[PDB]
């Protein structure tokens, strides 16, 4: 759902 940060 964002993933890498």
């Amino acid at each position: 759902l964002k993933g890498p940060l």
Partner: antibody
Amino acid sequence: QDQLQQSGAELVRPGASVKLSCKALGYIFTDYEIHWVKQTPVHGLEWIGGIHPGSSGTAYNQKFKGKATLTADKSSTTAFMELSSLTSEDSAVYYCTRKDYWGQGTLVTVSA
Amino acid sequence: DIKMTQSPSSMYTSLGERVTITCKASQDINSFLTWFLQKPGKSPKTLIYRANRLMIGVPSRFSGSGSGQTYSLTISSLEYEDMGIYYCLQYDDFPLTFGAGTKLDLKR
């Protein structure tokens, strides 16, 4: 897709430590970040930090860096959050979240 | 730190009514935005994610639009079980930031 399962309510003494746990069920534990969120009637909701169990990389709110340690264990699909040097101000409801799912929260009561 | 400005902060509503709740971001969040609801002494429950995707299990009564800075949650006809506090959450950047909350009650 299923759930996050959080440890039980904790009653601790000022200046002690607390390790909370977040069990991930029914989804691939290594594909999603787990994020920990603090809630209290004075501050509202605030983000502590997050962990990627795949890479093992973490991101922290600057306010909790040095206080809170985020780790994950692949073999038990459990994320943990350690809180040190506790004070009355750490009294709150702590949640793990996947951004879509939410565990049920652990109540942490710091008191003498 | 991206600011989330949720308004209104409390609303007096009738069952049956259509409500709209909003979040402005201080910078373009690229639709990375969730909408969730909290009931007294209860863990949050997500309704929408990515600005408009409904969540498996959520009545079709809920709907969310927006892009850029201004995001919105509409409840087409209010039901008794809809009452609680509504939050919004940006996850475009760290740190994650939330809105102050939007409290709904029945007018009388």
